[PDB]
Amino acid sequence: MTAAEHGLHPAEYPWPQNGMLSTFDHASLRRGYQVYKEVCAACHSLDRIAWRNLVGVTHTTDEAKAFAEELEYDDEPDDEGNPRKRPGKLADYIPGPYPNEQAARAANQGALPPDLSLIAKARHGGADYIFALLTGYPDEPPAGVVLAPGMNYNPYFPGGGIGMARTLFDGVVEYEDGTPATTSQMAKDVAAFLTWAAEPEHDERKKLGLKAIIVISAMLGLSVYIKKFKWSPIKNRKFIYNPP
Amino acid sequence: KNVIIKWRGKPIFIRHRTSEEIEEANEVNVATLRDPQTDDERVQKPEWLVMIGVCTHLGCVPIGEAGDFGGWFCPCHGSHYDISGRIRRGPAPLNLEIPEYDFADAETLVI
Amino acid sequence: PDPAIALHEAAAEGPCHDFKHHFDECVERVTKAQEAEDYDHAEYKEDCVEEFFHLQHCINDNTADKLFRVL
Amino acid sequence: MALRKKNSLLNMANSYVLDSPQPSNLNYFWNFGSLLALCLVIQLATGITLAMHYTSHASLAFDSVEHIMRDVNFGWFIRYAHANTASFFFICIYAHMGRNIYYGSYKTPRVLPWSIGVIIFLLLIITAFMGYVLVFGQMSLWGATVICNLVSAIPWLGEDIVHFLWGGFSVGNPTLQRFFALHYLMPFVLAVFALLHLIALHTAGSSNPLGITSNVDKLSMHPYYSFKDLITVFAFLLMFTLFVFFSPDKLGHPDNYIPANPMVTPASIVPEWYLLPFYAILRAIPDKLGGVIAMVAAILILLILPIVDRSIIRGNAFKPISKLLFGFFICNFLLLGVLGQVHIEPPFIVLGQICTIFYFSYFLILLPMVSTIENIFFYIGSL
Amino acid sequence: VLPWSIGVIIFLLLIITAFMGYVLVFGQMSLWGATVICNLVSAIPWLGEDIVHFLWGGFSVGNPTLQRFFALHYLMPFVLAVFALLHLIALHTAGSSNPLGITSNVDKLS
Amino acid sequence: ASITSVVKTSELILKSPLLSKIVVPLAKTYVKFSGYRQLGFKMNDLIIEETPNMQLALRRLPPTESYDRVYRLIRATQFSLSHKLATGNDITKPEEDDHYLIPYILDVEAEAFEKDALDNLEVV
Amino acid sequence: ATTFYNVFVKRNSAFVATILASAFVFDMTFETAIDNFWDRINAGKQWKDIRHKY
Amino acid sequence: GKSTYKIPDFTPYLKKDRNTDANRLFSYFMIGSFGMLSAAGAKATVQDFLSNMSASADVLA
Amino acid sequence: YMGWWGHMGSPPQKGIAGYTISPFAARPFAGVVHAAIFNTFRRTKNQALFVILPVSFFYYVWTQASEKNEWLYTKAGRHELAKAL
Ligand code: HEC
Numbered sequence A: 001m002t003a004a005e006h007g008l009h010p011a012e013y014p015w016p017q018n019g020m021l022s023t024f025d026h027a028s029l030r031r032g033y034q035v036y037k038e039v040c041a042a043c044h045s046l047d048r049i050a051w052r053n054l055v056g057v058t059h060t061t062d063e064a065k066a067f068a069e070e071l072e073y074d075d076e077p078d079d080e081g082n083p084r085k086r087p088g089k090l091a092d093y094i095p096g097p098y099p100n101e102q103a104a105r106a107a108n109q110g111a112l113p114p115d116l117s118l119i120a121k122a123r124h125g126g127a128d129y130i131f132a133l134l135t136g137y138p139d140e141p142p143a144g145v146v147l148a149p150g151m152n153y154n155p156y157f158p159g160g161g162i163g164m165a166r167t168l169f170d171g172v173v174e175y176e177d178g179t180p181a182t183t184s185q186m187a188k189d190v191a192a193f194l195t196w197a198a199e200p201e202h203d204e205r206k207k208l209g210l211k212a213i214i215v216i217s218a219m220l221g222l223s224v225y226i227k228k229f230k231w232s233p234i235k236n237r238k239f240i241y242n243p244p
Numbered sequence B: 001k002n003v004i005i006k007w008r009g010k011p012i013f014i015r016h017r018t019s020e021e022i023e024e025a026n027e028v029n030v031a032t033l034r035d036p037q038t039d040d041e042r043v044q045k046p047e048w049l050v051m052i053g054v055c056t057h058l059g060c061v062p063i064g065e066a067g068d069f070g071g072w073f074c075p076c077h078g079s080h081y082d083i084s085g086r087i088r089r090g091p092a093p094l095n096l097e098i099p100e101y102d103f104a105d106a107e108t109l110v111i
Numbered sequence C: 001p002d003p004a005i006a007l008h009e010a011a012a013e014g015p016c017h018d019f020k021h022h023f024d025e026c027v028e029r030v031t032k033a034q035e036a037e038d039y040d041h042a043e044y045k046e047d048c049v050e051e052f053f054h055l056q057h058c059i060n061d062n063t064a065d066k067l068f069r070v071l
Numbered sequence D: 001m002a003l004r005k006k007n008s009l010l011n012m013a014n015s016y017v018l019d020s021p022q023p024s025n026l027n028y029f030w031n032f033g034s035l036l037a038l039c040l041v042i043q044l045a046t047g048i049t050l051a052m053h054y055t056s057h058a059s060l061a062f063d064s065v066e067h068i069m070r071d072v073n074f075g076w077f078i079r080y081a082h083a084n085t086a087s088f089f090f091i092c093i094y095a096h097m098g099r100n101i102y103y104g105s106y107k108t109p110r111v112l113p114w115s116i117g118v119i120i121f122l123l124l125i126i127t128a129f130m131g132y133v134l135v136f137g138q139m140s141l142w143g144a145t146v147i148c149n150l151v152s153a154i155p156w157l158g159e160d161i162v163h164f165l166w167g168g169f170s171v172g173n174p175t176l177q178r179f180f181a182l183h184y185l186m187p188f189v190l191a192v193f194a195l196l197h198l199i200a201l202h203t204a205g206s207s208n209p210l211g212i213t214s215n216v217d218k219l220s221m222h223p224y225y226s227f228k229d230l231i232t233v234f235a236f237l238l239m240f241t242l243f244v245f246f247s248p249d250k251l252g253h254p255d256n257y258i259p260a261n262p263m264v265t266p267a268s269i270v271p272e273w274y275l276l277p278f279y280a281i282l283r284a285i286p287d288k289l290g291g292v293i294a295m296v297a298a299i300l301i302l303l304i305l306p307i308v309d310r311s312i313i314r315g316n317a318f319k320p321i322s323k324l325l326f327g328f329f330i331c332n333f334l335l336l337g338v339l340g341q342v343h344i345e346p347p348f349i350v351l352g353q354i355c356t357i358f359y360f361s362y363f364l365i366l367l368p369m370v371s372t373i374e375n376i377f378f379y380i381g382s383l
Numbered sequence E: 001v002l003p004w005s006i007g008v009i010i011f012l013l014l015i016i017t018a019f020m021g022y023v024l025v026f027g028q029m030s031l032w033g034a035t036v037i038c039n040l041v042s043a044i045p046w047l048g049e050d051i052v053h054f055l056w057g058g059f060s061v062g063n064p065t066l067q068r069f070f071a072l073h074y075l076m077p078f079v080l081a082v083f084a085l086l087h088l089i090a091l092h093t094a095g096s097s098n099p100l101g102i103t104s105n106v107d108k109l110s
Numbered sequence F: 001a002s003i004t005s006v007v008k009t010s011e012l013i014l015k016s017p018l019l020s021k022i023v024v025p026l027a028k029t030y031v032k033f034s035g036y037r038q039l040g041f042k043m044n045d046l047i048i049e050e051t052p053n054m055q056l057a058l059r060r061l062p063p064t065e066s067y068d069r070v071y072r073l074i075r076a077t078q079f080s081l082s083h084k085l086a087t088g089n090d091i092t093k094p095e096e097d098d099h100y101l102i103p104y105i106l107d108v109e110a111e112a113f114e115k116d117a118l119d120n121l122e123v124v
Numbered sequence G: 001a002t003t004f005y006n007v008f009v010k011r012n013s014a015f016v017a018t019i020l021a022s023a024f025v026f027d028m029t030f031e032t033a034i035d036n037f038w039d040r041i042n043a044g045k046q047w048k049d050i051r052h053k054y
Numbered sequence H: 001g002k003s004t005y006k007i008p009d010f011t012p013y014l015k016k017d018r019n020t021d022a023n024r025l026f027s028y029f030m031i032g033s034f035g036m037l038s039a040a041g042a043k044a045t046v047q048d049f050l051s052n053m054s055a056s057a058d059v060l061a
Numbered sequence I: 001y002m003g004w005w006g007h008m009g010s011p012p013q014k015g016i017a018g019y020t021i022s023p024f025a026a027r028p029f030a031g032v033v034h035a036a037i038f039n040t041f042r043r044t045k046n047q048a049l050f051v052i053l054p055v056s057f058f059y060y061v062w063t064q065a066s067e068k069n070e071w072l073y074t075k076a077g078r079h080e081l082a083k084a085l
């Protein structure tokens, strides 16, 4: 295939979580949630994440309950069987911007903005792809590219023509921790956040792996000693043959 | 007008072709056609183009009325289908498949 | 301001200069060819995507580490 | 008389795992048998556990796998363990088949364990294909679509058989629920055949890397091969750990994290990596039915090794020419694997066909010729 | 004695298999039967309550219980088949008894 | 393949001057690279013995030859498991690589092939 | 050192008891040791390190 | 090469202190360590793995 | 074809005397350094060609094919690609 049809492959950036012993930077995760909430959530859902998932990752229990309680969710019908709404609870999932696919496509000139809960696992490149894509809109498409109407040129997207316009510009977010909200900073944070969303076990998984590696390594070393020990009678065996 | 009916999940383009549209389709010499077929082979009723609305190339849905043969244009790799829904230009090998459809009444078809 | 802007510009003028000039020359050719009439009724319309990818790929190799170091 | 010999049940265990007389010179490639048994046990344990959390209905299946990843305690581990062990199962099975081909384990008197083994290999493929579908991601659906459409090639009845497999007119809910049930079952059938091939083998005993009789010099299975098997168990677990804990998605296709969408077709539909050589063989033949027959024949042709190997000597340890031919055969099988995942483009089209011809000509031409010639060289060479 | 004793275990597995299969319908008797039978484990001293919550995968019989019983109900018949085969292998050393209770070694039939 | 077949074919080659001139040197190098002598085997030790014919031929070996064969197999098995090669007197020298078994298997097979032929005789 | 053998190793009951008690101790101490190690190499990154702001 | 009472040379492998308690104890220390890590590893494996059957996060919510 | 302990189906053995020492009496890692270096080098050297020849050939084949394929799908390779299809 042409390189265009594949998309340019994203650079390997040194994410804090790259590295066998490295967790996510939770401060970056928190910043990234704020980017999701103020920019991406206009078009993209995060349906597999519940408010409770943020607790003790990015937010305290209280902050997350506050986020839940601001929204209205469908309750069980009342006693006359009429529909009712209730305020959100931590068990509720973060609600999407559109009620269905058709509404989503209508608002985006036919393109359907994917749910972002898994997008870091669902594209080759992961965090790097999300970072490259958000930051990789050139001012002008390379001369000779014909964009379909409502498409934007982005070399990292396969085919080049992406239905999502550039959305991160310096200072679209005001971070609550005083970090300068540059395009690059926001893309890094949101890409980290989405990576966490796709694999929330990441931190625990790598710690258990460290324990496993250590125990299994020691057992492997000992199994070699024990094998050699038990086999030495066979390896050391000597013969004397006297033809009869 | 061209409708999109879901049938086995796959979209079905149903176009209510005008007289002059039928004429435009009945022009092209069968000789010069990747997939050689005339409209008569495709439709059982000249006013009802029923096709499986998925592009024969890879499997996008062509944008109707667009094209260069003013039928259907797949935006993905730029393959142009006709008012018979025959492939004319672009990577697509075959004409847009026809489902198994019958006119039970003259005002209702089953697919 | 965005650190990437400066780093990308520096890498284009410096270690990726050959590719910068290739992309530039490509653009010049294509724009001139689009300016000429009966371009719309041509078989093959040249683009600059290949040259762009070579440049971007190069810039990214010389920048990725530097950029994340200042965030 | 000792209890382990006296009691009929204990004595069956004893005869397989303790007093079983083994050659005293088995090398590390005889350890794949036990690794495969370990994979089979891991797959049963993790598989049955996933089944406790998975929902087979197409409306819920993908989401149930996300629920396992996100909500179930250690669900991430059990899911990744099951998915990665499926890859290791094929690495070990290819290694085991490779060992058997190199050392002539398929020759008399071991044709029966070999032939049952070829069926085990087919069941593993079916098991792993159905298991892949259960995720009901994009690759799940499109892989099921393309692979089940191969049955359409069967003349006259093909179309009808496909609709019968699907339980429907496309891959959807009925297909998913049936694959769940069968995917649960197939590993038990596979375990039975694995046990049968061992019972068949027990009449001749294991071959050994010299290819001579070991009747002259035997060693109890325990403790010697028990403790030797531990080394590869821990080496395996280290490799398992690096995948499951540190790179759980290295062997995976990202597209399987997108829910199945019958409208959108993925860029490239390729099978899981371990089926790729068979996929390359299928693409090589232009005819639909031809392709399917070739693909099946690529597995069933293993059944003729006992016939086409004309050597008077068992295995390749002492046969320089056979060893070179085997090296080329193995590397070609890997090239087929690679060509299974490239795009159907020049120049890989012609290359795929040449590799497929080399694959078949090994069994049909080269092995019979080379084995005949080496027979003569050993005889004339030692005169 | 050995085929008999393995048989007693087959009988227990059959009971468990059939109990779990009954739950899968998830009718009223399915649910209430699961509730009362699983609550018997609450009797086990000290850990009883904890074990019941562990069986249920929850605080009552519900979805987690149903899905796990499906998986186990599928499995248990294969375990039962293995034990059935074991009790036959155990029996094959003595051969079947007969209604007179004497040896049949004197008079056998294929 | 049958030992009979191998031996007949080899004799056809050794007869033809041209063929022997090109095959004998190749076969000698093949045997050197084969490396069975480095484990103290004679060529005949390597012939597959799990067939009725070969079991019969081994039973017909003179006791001395039979005892020595068992020693070479045991010794080679020990070298194999140790990942060592034979040294000194354990290496089979070309003059010691005698076809001790070929006569016995050729006789066993001769009778077995005559039996097959005569089972198919038709009085004319 | 004969003494050590005689007490902890000679009887298998004692040897297995020793192994299980050692496994208990190892399991508890290894857990604690890795926890501390993990927190040092991932310093300022984890929730526990930023939680104090809230 | 002939007498079977002349034991072949094992001096490259024989331990001088072979009959001491120290000698046995050391090999049992290796076996015991291996048993200890296997026990700790099995406990960890069993505990983590079976915990899948305790109430999941959505149920606990 | 194989018996069991006591009747394994060996030809009669006579006159082989087999000697070995206890695992507790031996050094399990005796001469490990010599083996790990010299023995492994010997065994690897003797097998090297049988691995290197097929690997190098098929890697070269793949390299040539992947480079041609890449080149055909450039601007420069347009004409050669048109002919190849
Ligand atoms: C107002 C619209 C809009 C906003 C704001 C928006 N997106 Fe998107 N996004 C889209 C649409 C539409 C698509 C689908 C594009 C297509 O398929 O052509 C999309 C696609 C994506 C994709 C996947 C592209 C692919 O490979 O399929 C990612 C990742 C993404 N968006 C992330 C984000 C992030 C991160 C933000 C903001 C921080 C963001 N989006 C803001 C509309 C938006």
Ligand code: HEM
Pocket: D029, D030, D031, D032, D033, D034, D036, D037, D040, D093, D096, D097, D100, D105, D106, D110, D113, D114, D116, D117, D118, D120, D121, D190, D194, D197, D198, D201, D205, D206, D207, D208
């Ligand atoms: C679940 C899959 C399998 C398991 C668990 C399994 C297990 C084993 C075990 C334990 C042995 C004895 C020890 C060994 O040689 O490694 C063995 C031998 C053998 N297996 Fe497999 N096997 C499996 C699949 C296969 C397949 C697919 C084949 C053939 C295509 C096969 C053919 C053989 C043969 C021929 C032997 C005898 C080899 C010899 O010892 O010389 N097996 N297997």
Ligand code: HEM
Pocket: D040, D043, D044, D046, D047, D048, D049, D050, D051, D054, D065, D079, D082, D083, D086, D089, D124, D127, D128, D129, D131, D132, D133, D134, D135, D183, D184, D187, D188, D190
């Ligand atoms: C030889 C044994 C087995 C093999 C090779 C195998 C293979 C696979 C594979 C490849 C998948 C796709 C995994 C993924 O990418 O997520 C899978 C999924 C699954 N398997 Fe198996 N499997 C085996 C045994 C079993 C058994 C015994 C069960 C018991 C039910 C089972 C239950 C499942 C379930 C529920 C899934 C879907 C959940 C998921 O994707 O993880 N498997 N299997």
Ligand code: HEM
Pocket: E003, E004, E006, E007, E008, E010, E011, E080, E084, E087, E088, E091, E095, E096, E097, E098
């Ligand atoms: C799946 C359940 C079972 C199957 C398929 C099964 C099958 C059989 C078969 C085929 C026989 C030999 C023929 C016969 O005597 O009828 C037999 C004998 C026997 N079974 Fe079962 N059995 C099962 C359950 C049980 C149970 C639950 C027990 C005991 C509690 C049991 C105890 C025995 C005994 C003691 C014999 C020997 C009886 C004799 O021949 O004198 N079996 N079983």
Ligand SMILES: CCCCCCCCCCCCO[C@@H]1O[C@H](CO)[C@@H](O[C@H]2O[C@H](CO)[C@@H](O)[C@H](O)[C@H]2O)[C@H](O)[C@H]1O
Pocket: D005, D008, D011, D012, D013, D014, D015, D016, D017, D019, D199, D202, I003, I004
């Ligand atoms: C691998 C997991 C462990 C469980 C065992 C595997 C289950 C398969 C066992 C049933 C198959 C029958 O297994 C068969 O039984 C008998 C006795 O047990 C064995 O018989 C062998 O051992 C006994 C004594 O140990 C001798 O009387 C006999 O001369 C010898 O051939 C067969 O060689 C074996 O083929």
Ligand SMILES: CCCCCCCCCCCCO[C@@H]1O[C@H](CO)[C@@H](O[C@H]2O[C@H](CO)[C@@H](O)[C@H](O)[C@H]2O)[C@H](O)[C@H]1O
Pocket: A204, A208, H046, H047, H048, H049, H050, H051, H054
């Ligand atoms: C006969 C066998 C006996 C029965 C087997 C018992 C089965 C279940 C027992 C414990 C399972 C739940 O018990 C719990 O285990 C998990 C690890 O899984 C531990 O959890 C700890 O480690 C995990 C990761 O390792 C973290 O996610 C967690 O935040 C931390 O607290 C809990 O501290 C313990 O309370």
Ligand code: FES
Pocket: B055, B056, B057, B058, B059, B060, B074, B075, B076, B077, B078, B079, B090, B091, B092
């Ligand atoms: S997908 Fe329709 S033109 Fe390529």
